[PDB]
Request: fold
Amino acid sequence: SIAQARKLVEQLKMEANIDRIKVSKAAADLMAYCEAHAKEDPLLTPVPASENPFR
Amino acid sequence: QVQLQESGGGLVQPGGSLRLSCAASGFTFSNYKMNWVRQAPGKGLEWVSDISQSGASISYTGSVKGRFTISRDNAKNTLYLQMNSLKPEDTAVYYCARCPAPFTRDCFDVTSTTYAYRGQGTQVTVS
Amino acid sequence: LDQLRQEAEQLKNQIRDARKACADATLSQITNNIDPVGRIQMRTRRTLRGHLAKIYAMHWGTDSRLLVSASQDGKLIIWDSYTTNKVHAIPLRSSWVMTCAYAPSGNYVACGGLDNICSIYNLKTREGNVRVSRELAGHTGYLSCCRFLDDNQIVTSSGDTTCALWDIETGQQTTTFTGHTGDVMSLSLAPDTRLFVSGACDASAKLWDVREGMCRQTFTGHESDINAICFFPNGNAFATGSDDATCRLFDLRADQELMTYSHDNIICGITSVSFSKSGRLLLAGYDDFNCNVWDALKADRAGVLAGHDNRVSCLGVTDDGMAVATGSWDSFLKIWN
Amino acid sequence: LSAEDKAAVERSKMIEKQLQKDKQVYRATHRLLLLGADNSGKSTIVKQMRIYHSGIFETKFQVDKVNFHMFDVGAQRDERRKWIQCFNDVTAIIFVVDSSDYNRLQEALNDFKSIWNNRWLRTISVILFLNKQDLLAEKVLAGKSKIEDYFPEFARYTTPEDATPEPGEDPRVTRAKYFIRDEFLRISTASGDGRHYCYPHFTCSVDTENARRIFNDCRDIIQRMHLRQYELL
Amino acid sequence: ALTFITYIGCGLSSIFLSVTLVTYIAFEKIRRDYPSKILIQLCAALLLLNLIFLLDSWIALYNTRGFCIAVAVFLHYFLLVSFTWMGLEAFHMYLALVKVFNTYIRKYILKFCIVGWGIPAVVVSIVLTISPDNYGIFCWINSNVVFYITVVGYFCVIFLLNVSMFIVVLVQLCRIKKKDLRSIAGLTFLLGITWGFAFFAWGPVNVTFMYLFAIFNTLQGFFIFIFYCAAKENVRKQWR
Amino acid sequence: VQLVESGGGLVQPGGSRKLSCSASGFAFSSFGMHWVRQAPEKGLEWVAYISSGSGTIYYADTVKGRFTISRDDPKNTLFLQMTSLRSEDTAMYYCVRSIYYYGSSPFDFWGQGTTLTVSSSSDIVMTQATSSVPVTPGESVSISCRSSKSLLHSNGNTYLYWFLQRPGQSPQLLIYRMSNLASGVPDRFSGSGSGTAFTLTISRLEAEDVGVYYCMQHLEYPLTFGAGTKLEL
Ligand SMILES: C[C@]12CC[C@H](O)CC1=CC[C@@H]1[C@@H]2CC[C@]2(C)C(=O)CC[C@@H]12
Reply:
């Protein structure tokens, strides 16, 4: 309709003028979070059995 | 983005011929069944034809059965509907549509209103 | 109308050219010299049995012991996964419940499905049972996901192409989130509770600000119905799951799919997606009766959690990120660790 | 185990005792999905059956001491691919058809192709009700609407030898009746491969036997499921 | 003679019944339906029957009165438990094919275990109470009046129930297929329809019918394996 | 939530009286309920416990073979029949409410009391050594507690419960499982300890907190209560 397509364009204009930092910087920040919280992931490094609460 | 842009269509005479093309971008065309759905003025949507992955499951609605033919091309990601002989009760907005999920022949809610993976439309007028 | 639509396409062209020039590198080559995650062997410690129909959804508690599970028998069961005990059982008016949430205080459990009503259940009652705290109604579609913000505020994603923030004490919509053109299946709250992403059946995920009811930004790259969505643990990224046998990781600052998680042998649909506590092991949940565990930075399976008999409808990792609860359509929930 | 742990294990066992009591209720009731079009007499099949015996309405009828839940959708939208997976363990699907109209049969056939072939709606049998037989009887005797326009395979068709015409029925009506069934059964007998079965019935709007028709079909469905448990089928 | 095949048959029954029990108790995906749990109890009866019979055929050299009777108690109880579980397999199909609805009784298998393991437990106890000498002679019943009251006569109660349900299965399986050989033959070896060869075998009419009682009814546990464990697609999928 | 008690009076020694506490205001079948008695110038001593939907019946050593506790779930009444009443039976008996699950609050609601006046080892000694403490409003008082056996189970929950008995009122739960706070209690109260020795800390002591403070062990099945710590003004 005429009403919906006005909203599509006002949404996309509001979407287009945002700030985008580079993906290589965005990839590095996600990489840095996983390496910093490496000990804070029992799914990655297995917890000793005593610690596991589901043993 | 799932963008189905279908060209073709126009003011054709009765007994004329038209090919409706359908350019599709943003998805692997060879993994999905594709559909044609038409909406005649003020009587809702109606399913027309459906070709499966690499053909071999072509089925039609009854009113266009001997007349219209569908063909997919899994190289340019293009869908075709060749219309051979047109009555003037075939006037509609014809839409390129797609089966909801991939790897299946289970086309639910293709003719449903506000369907996402359906084209913008192309007008075929017969007079 | 055609002046509007062509303007809308060149905004899409302006965005796509902005995203293309924003991608100098990719996560495949930024993370190509880190150590591989290795094989993550992981088995069931607890087979939680007692449901009568398919376990459609679950949600963990914040103390990582309690979890509620929704099933199509008309029951919510609160489980103690440490000891396999049933802490509570909640009978429902409607047996078609498609979601449940556990509040981050332990005081309430929501549910919602085809009855178009978010039923809040008061757990910590003086009278000694569960009752219906609030029948949040107003949606005109099935409630597919709900998540509690903090103890009086809940966002509910619905089948009427809308999300809605509700005040439980008044029963009303404080804000409403519209813009999706298809059925909205899942929502995920960022870990500071100010933004939320919703994945819907129009091959797009929208980031919404909960404080003024608008969409910041729309994430495309998927090609079928998104049934699963989950934030990264910091809050700057989120992964999605859909029917196209792909999981895609979307950063909120640079708007791209940084990695597709998709092999060629996988042909089914992803029903559930949740990260670990670090975001190195993306656990997804599929329709091949299995739960593949992806490395979130290198696109390879770290192991398959294969112990279920039907579709794994729900999959959740604890808030200390130490146990994974996968519930399936075979009425069994399984604690992997 | 401590003193509070052993009472908590007991409190699980009283929830076992409540849920095994509710498993007696759940297995003895049979969930059925009423999914039909708006033109069809779907609300009439609600109304007639419940006298004789919100996004979901629920109709419960009891025939020969057994329970039968029936659910139809209300405020749900016309997109039908995500909520239809919830009804994957229902006993049967009632697909009510307005057989009298002809411009919307093929929409109901494409609805019927979608339900019958779906990867989660498979192993569910369909109790096909072909409603509006009385107005179909008036329309064919009038002869105003030609079936051959919408379906160009009604010309090379003949009535089947195993047909059962009710007495005082014109042969054109019976030819029109069983054509709509065979359009609806070559959908079902092409992809099921002995996983689920279609039960077609020619029903009137105000017929008072549709509960017995469901019960006779639902007896077969749970019979066939039990034969597969010994792999007899 | 048959004695020989008897020993290779009981061995081939027992070791492939053991494959059936380790498959069904460990793999939980093939145990959800009620025929599967009755199948395990029938296989557990038929496993223990063969092992005691092979024990009764080679460890009968001891002439102690106590255990000659004991082993004859254990051979009698395991034979009557297996006959009862054959009948309860037939009884379950009356509550699955004839009476199709309202057949979920809570603790359904547990009520069948009281009928399957305890109704034989009463009747072996009371004939031991009347006169224990009967069991202790190969230690088998020497009284021979209770051979036709408790062994054969109780089997005749089972056999008329099992054949009548076997007819009803053929009555039902026609009425779908009017409106497959592996399927029928499974119901033969599940219910002991082929145990009706004993009525000819015990009479001196044919050596052949005596042979068929030895080749089929001894290899029943082998045939339960290749019609309800090896012949199911879900079991073979879960073996990988 | 109301637990009013009936029965009790002037019972001659060797007699028999049945005590019933009625429950109007909470669900009865979900709570496992105890009987605790208060001697006139002594402390509290637990005598009975029946589970919710009765499966285990625990008694104390002094009331083991002579008392019986039964449970009427439809009529919301808890029965305590007594035989062979010795003089020590003299006491005012409380009807005690307790649910047991993870994160639950046992001993949360107590009754009101019914005066009974009879006419003329393995148990954990919960010693207190805190008979009296001179207190003023506003200071931060500490109430001590010691156990004969360590109350820290291998779960991680150390089973220590605190009660406040006002001078003319029933006891009220303050903190449970060592330090879990109860619902109506203000944030002034705080609990600590190390498995064997224990400490309750009232930090902003007001006028309504006058009374005798009791400790508890819920580790062993036979529950014991402390002598009492009276915070008089
Ligand atoms: C089958 C059965 C009885 C059932 C046992 O499981 C196996 C068995 C042992 C040898 C068989 C015996 C029945 C009677 C037989 C068949 C004979 O007469 C000779 C060997 C005997």
